[PDB]
């Protein structure tokens, strides 16, 4: 009969700070109850009307988060294997949700930033192999399936067969190899054999593969209207939806006889969308991961660059086009030599023979008053005015100064500031997301997406037909031992601080004056 | 003598000098056979590159060049992020523009040239405009297929190039130069600046500790130059075929003990005059004062 | 900072109050003339300038809804732009 959890839930719902901390320190099952307290307080703080009381609830939820961090830090510092059984324990509080899922739902990013939690996610990622095996041994065992039964891959953190092919690293590695073979087949169809009359054998293999990828995205979109709200929420579910919609528009346009070239180009832009998927597939990796995350935070500085450049590119381009007006005055021709010459001049392509009379041969080539010169090039105009050409050379010099020295070196300065400012928060965000990415590979039907139709048939058939108790007591008493040592050391550190020594001296001198008088 | 072979296999530059000599033996052995002259002629060229990169390890002893050579190998994870993001973007751009204006020379190494090797040189300022832009090419009925075609200039650019939707090829050039030359290069400078200012202090601490064993290596070497070093190896082969004062140490150690005692007395005075131990001693004096009243 | 931390609407009526001291000059104009740059750096003052900038719409309406309503004047009378501050 331990009713301490009823008084904990009572003190959390009425927002009593000192009550809820005391009721935490007396009850058991402490790591899960601190994550449950942090979750419940943040849910009720978003639902709060008064601003001061929502601020009060977010301060208390931050206190419970730091206590679960400090307690699990000491439980991990004693024994790694036993603390691993402490996090991964089924349904400690309020339904089947482990401590990692309570840390995920509460947005407790300081709990995932520990070295103990990241070590347990590394052990979970490698399955039932050892987490120190190098990646080349994983590659040699992957491309040689009989080489599993040797002394390269040490196990224990037809049995070794499902110890190799059951780990999340080999579901990842099989997914990457199958996705690169999809791109290699896509490129072979698009660059070598794309017949105008009838689709060949290799293109029908491509259409079959894209049907398997479509059924995979409906399986992650259904396996029901709130689930569609969740699939519409992400940006990369929308991007894989975007790749498949451009694919259907390309194949549907190709099959009509009057629209061959339109589908021929829509599939090329579709190839770019499928290859940018690979930036999201490798966010699970330990070295490439966090750096891919920081790239999307560097895009407000690129947009300042494009703003300042487009103001300056219009100013330079229309001025030099007006100064030496040419004789080919088509609309796309002048849009070429207004926007597209100066954009390539900031990358080192400076055409001097198109806009400088000293490099051109003169002549009476126009039908108008004035002196004219004949440029070289099929797009540079046909005759160019010679009046005030030193001003065109000065506008080139000023353009190269402002574009290549101000804007490029200032952009390097802004990228350096933004990077050193957001780098720490991007590490904290990546570790918290690293749990749910691993859980995605562990929850996937482990069969490669060219051959994944087998598992979708089996799930279609199933859709047509519709610790021990003493081990938990030993575990929780072990946790309560370390909770008491944590709280005693916290009390000794507060008592030996300098300000409470100053309080205790002040009260002793005050009672000394009470003894004299 | 087998544990010494474990030590020689342990280092990376003992392995590299082993690597230079193994490529040398493969080059000389291939040269002497009559049917393999050109193979040894090229293996010795790559071997020349491996011998010249030794000079980066010889000058880690130097006082100015030393620590900076050490920091260079710690900057290689950011180069590998650059090569990852670039290869994703280089395949995306190259296969799209090759598909959009399909050419008529469709050899395998020819299309691998103009898929991987054109865009890699476009990030260094080599932008060939007359090979992929219909406004700069002369048109003509140069193919044997339905559609409008144009004839590029260059022996590797294809022979006929499709004119359909060429404004999309010009837009893919503009987007490529934006992502490659502005994002990836300026972001790489930002990551090198962060990594450098983060690992610079630990690389100084590592270099000073290694600076002892490098000096000891030159002091332990037979001092005769490696063109003429056969003399010292003959002399060591002959030798292999045939098989302070006490009062000065007492004065030294008593001098050390004098400075040990002054060090410990100053450490005790600094701890005693600190503010927290003054606060302890006042607290205990007031407590014994209450014991004297009561 | 504390008057804003209690109630946002009532502190908005506190800054924007006509002629509190020495002629018609509100607290924002006294902060402007004094060069009090630490007073404008608050999150309360910048939130009230965001509400003043958007007029009598809501300050959370995205810019594309403003563009669609600008280039389609009959599209004002729909449920895109929520009014009352
Ligand atoms: Na440059």
Short mmCIF file of C-alpha atoms in Angstrom, two decimals, chain A residues 39-238:
data_model
loop_
_atom_site.label_atom_id
_atom_site.label_comp_id
_atom_site.label_asym_id
_atom_site.label_seq_id
_atom_site.Cartn_x
_atom_site.Cartn_y
_atom_site.Cartn_z
CA UNK A 39 4.93 15.37 -20.02
CA UNK A 40 1.75 16.11 -18.09
CA UNK A 41 2.87 19.58 -17.00
CA UNK A 42 3.82 20.64 -20.53
CA UNK A 43 0.49 19.40 -21.92
CA UNK A 44 -1.37 21.43 -19.31
CA UNK A 45 0.89 24.46 -19.80
CA UNK A 46 -0.05 24.78 -23.46
CA UNK A 47 -3.71 24.60 -22.42
CA UNK A 48 -3.39 27.38 -19.81
CA UNK A 49 -5.25 30.69 -19.99
CA UNK A 50 -3.27 32.82 -17.53
CA UNK A 51 0.23 33.60 -18.76
CA UNK A 52 1.85 33.58 -15.32
CA UNK A 53 0.49 30.14 -14.48
CA UNK A 54 1.70 28.70 -17.78
CA UNK A 55 5.11 30.17 -16.97
CA UNK A 56 4.87 28.52 -13.55
CA UNK A 57 4.10 25.11 -15.04
CA UNK A 58 6.95 25.28 -17.52
CA UNK A 59 9.40 26.04 -14.71
CA UNK A 60 8.21 23.04 -12.69
CA UNK A 61 8.38 20.74 -15.72
CA UNK A 62 11.99 21.82 -16.24
CA UNK A 63 12.73 20.81 -12.64
CA UNK A 64 11.35 17.28 -13.11
CA UNK A 65 13.35 16.89 -16.32
CA UNK A 66 16.63 17.70 -14.57
CA UNK A 67 15.85 15.23 -11.78
CA UNK A 68 15.32 12.35 -14.21
CA UNK A 69 18.61 13.27 -15.89
CA UNK A 70 20.54 13.31 -12.62
CA UNK A 71 19.00 10.11 -11.25
CA UNK A 72 19.55 8.12 -14.45
CA UNK A 73 23.07 9.52 -14.61
CA UNK A 74 23.90 7.81 -11.34
CA UNK A 75 22.02 4.59 -12.15
CA UNK A 76 24.01 4.37 -15.38
CA UNK A 77 27.25 5.23 -13.60
CA UNK A 78 26.88 2.13 -11.43
CA UNK A 79 25.76 -0.52 -13.93
CA UNK A 80 25.22 -0.15 -17.67
CA UNK A 81 23.35 -3.41 -18.27
CA UNK A 82 20.88 -2.92 -15.46
CA UNK A 83 20.05 0.67 -16.40
CA UNK A 84 19.49 -0.60 -19.94
CA UNK A 85 16.82 -2.86 -18.45
CA UNK A 86 15.43 0.17 -16.61
CA UNK A 87 14.67 2.30 -19.68
CA UNK A 88 13.46 -0.54 -21.90
CA UNK A 89 10.89 -1.85 -19.40
CA UNK A 90 7.39 -2.35 -20.77
CA UNK A 91 4.50 -0.13 -19.51
CA UNK A 92 5.78 1.54 -16.31
CA UNK A 93 3.06 4.23 -16.26
CA UNK A 94 -0.30 4.71 -17.99
CA UNK A 95 -0.41 2.15 -20.76
CA UNK A 96 2.26 0.57 -22.91
CA UNK A 97 4.81 3.37 -23.28
CA UNK A 98 8.43 2.98 -22.20
CA UNK A 99 10.62 5.74 -20.77
CA UNK A 100 12.01 6.60 -24.20
CA UNK A 101 8.51 7.15 -25.55
CA UNK A 102 7.64 9.36 -22.58
CA UNK A 103 10.82 11.31 -23.27
CA UNK A 104 9.84 11.60 -26.93
CA UNK A 105 6.29 12.82 -26.32
CA UNK A 106 7.35 15.34 -23.67
CA UNK A 107 10.04 16.91 -25.90
CA UNK A 108 12.67 16.26 -23.23
CA UNK A 109 15.75 17.01 -25.29
CA UNK A 110 18.08 17.16 -22.30
CA UNK A 111 17.30 13.53 -21.47
CA UNK A 112 18.46 12.26 -24.87
CA UNK A 113 21.66 14.31 -24.73
CA UNK A 114 23.22 12.02 -22.12
CA UNK A 115 26.04 9.66 -22.94
CA UNK A 116 24.17 6.76 -21.37
CA UNK A 117 21.09 7.17 -23.56
CA UNK A 118 23.12 7.59 -26.74
CA UNK A 119 25.12 4.48 -25.89
CA UNK A 120 21.91 2.49 -25.51
CA UNK A 121 20.62 3.78 -28.85
CA UNK A 122 23.90 2.66 -30.43
CA UNK A 123 23.42 -0.82 -28.95
CA UNK A 124 19.82 -0.89 -30.15
CA UNK A 125 20.88 0.23 -33.64
CA UNK A 126 23.36 -2.62 -34.07
CA UNK A 127 20.80 -5.24 -33.08
CA UNK A 128 22.36 -8.31 -31.50
CA UNK A 129 25.88 -7.81 -32.82
CA UNK A 130 28.57 -5.90 -31.00
CA UNK A 131 28.47 -2.13 -31.31
CA UNK A 132 32.23 -1.97 -31.98
CA UNK A 133 32.25 -3.93 -35.24
CA UNK A 134 33.57 -1.77 -38.10
CA UNK A 135 31.45 -0.95 -41.10
CA UNK A 136 33.68 -2.80 -43.58
CA UNK A 137 33.03 -6.05 -41.71
CA UNK A 138 29.32 -5.29 -42.07
CA UNK A 139 29.80 -4.72 -45.80
CA UNK A 140 31.79 -7.92 -46.35
CA UNK A 141 29.20 -9.91 -44.43
CA UNK A 142 26.42 -8.23 -46.41
CA UNK A 143 27.83 -9.05 -49.85
CA UNK A 144 28.97 -12.52 -48.71
CA UNK A 145 26.12 -14.21 -46.80
CA UNK A 146 28.13 -17.38 -45.98
CA UNK A 147 30.82 -15.18 -44.38
CA UNK A 148 28.44 -14.58 -41.43
CA UNK A 149 29.53 -17.90 -39.88
CA UNK A 150 33.14 -16.84 -39.15
CA UNK A 151 35.00 -14.89 -36.45
CA UNK A 152 34.46 -11.35 -37.70
CA UNK A 153 31.19 -10.31 -36.05
CA UNK A 154 31.09 -10.97 -32.31
CA UNK A 155 27.54 -11.40 -31.05
CA UNK A 156 25.87 -11.01 -27.60
CA UNK A 157 25.46 -7.20 -27.56
CA UNK A 158 19.58 -20.49 -37.97
CA UNK A 159 20.18 -18.23 -34.98
CA UNK A 160 23.11 -16.20 -36.33
CA UNK A 161 21.18 -15.86 -39.59
CA UNK A 162 18.39 -13.95 -37.87
CA UNK A 163 20.94 -12.17 -35.69
CA UNK A 164 22.52 -10.68 -38.81
CA UNK A 165 19.43 -10.00 -40.88
CA UNK A 166 17.36 -8.80 -37.93
CA UNK A 167 19.47 -5.84 -36.86
CA UNK A 168 18.37 -2.33 -37.87
CA UNK A 169 21.75 -1.66 -39.54
CA UNK A 170 21.08 -4.31 -42.17
CA UNK A 171 17.58 -3.06 -42.84
CA UNK A 172 19.20 0.33 -43.40
CA UNK A 173 22.00 -1.08 -45.53
CA UNK A 174 19.66 -3.19 -47.63
CA UNK A 175 17.43 -0.16 -48.14
CA UNK A 176 20.33 2.01 -49.32
CA UNK A 177 21.66 -0.57 -51.79
CA UNK A 178 18.19 -1.14 -53.23
CA UNK A 179 17.61 2.60 -53.59
CA UNK A 180 20.86 3.10 -55.48
CA UNK A 181 19.90 0.25 -57.81
CA UNK A 182 16.61 2.04 -58.47
CA UNK A 183 18.51 5.17 -59.48
CA UNK A 184 20.92 3.19 -61.66
CA UNK A 185 18.00 1.57 -63.47
CA UNK A 186 16.23 4.94 -63.82
CA UNK A 187 19.37 6.46 -65.37
CA UNK A 188 19.88 3.52 -67.73
CA UNK A 189 16.32 3.86 -69.03
CA UNK A 190 16.54 7.62 -69.35
CA UNK A 191 19.98 7.90 -70.98
CA UNK A 192 20.41 4.73 -73.06
CA UNK A 193 17.20 2.90 -74.01
CA UNK A 194 14.18 5.21 -74.17
CA UNK A 195 12.37 4.09 -77.29
CA UNK A 196 9.78 6.40 -78.89
CA UNK A 197 7.35 3.69 -79.99
CA UNK A 198 7.02 1.01 -77.31
CA UNK A 199 8.40 0.68 -73.76
CA UNK A 200 11.13 -1.94 -73.57
CA UNK A 201 11.73 -4.61 -70.92
CA UNK A 202 13.87 -2.43 -68.65
CA UNK A 203 11.28 0.33 -68.58
CA UNK A 204 8.58 -2.12 -67.52
CA UNK A 205 10.85 -3.20 -64.66
CA UNK A 206 11.03 0.50 -63.76
CA UNK A 207 7.23 0.81 -63.75
CA UNK A 208 6.98 -2.27 -61.55
CA UNK A 209 9.49 -0.85 -59.06
CA UNK A 210 7.60 2.43 -58.80
CA UNK A 211 4.39 0.54 -58.04
CA UNK A 212 6.14 -1.11 -55.09
CA UNK A 213 7.31 2.29 -53.84
CA UNK A 214 3.75 3.63 -54.14
CA UNK A 215 2.32 0.76 -52.08
CA UNK A 216 5.02 1.42 -49.49
CA UNK A 217 3.88 5.02 -49.11
CA UNK A 218 0.23 4.05 -48.75
CA UNK A 219 1.30 1.50 -46.14
CA UNK A 220 2.98 4.28 -44.16
CA UNK A 221 0.01 6.57 -44.82
CA UNK A 222 -2.71 4.14 -43.72
CA UNK A 223 -1.18 1.24 -41.78
CA UNK A 224 -7.80 6.80 -40.68
CA UNK A 225 -8.28 10.47 -41.53
CA UNK A 226 -6.04 11.65 -38.69
CA UNK A 227 -3.32 9.39 -40.11
CA UNK A 228 -3.70 11.29 -43.39
CA UNK A 229 -3.25 14.49 -41.37
CA UNK A 230 0.00 13.00 -40.05
CA UNK A 231 1.21 12.03 -43.53
CA UNK A 232 0.47 15.53 -44.80
CA UNK A 233 2.32 17.03 -41.82
CA UNK A 234 5.89 16.08 -42.76
CA UNK A 235 7.97 17.59 -45.55
CA UNK A 236 9.58 14.35 -46.77
CA UNK A 237 6.37 12.37 -46.88
CA UNK A 238 5.24 15.25 -49.10
#
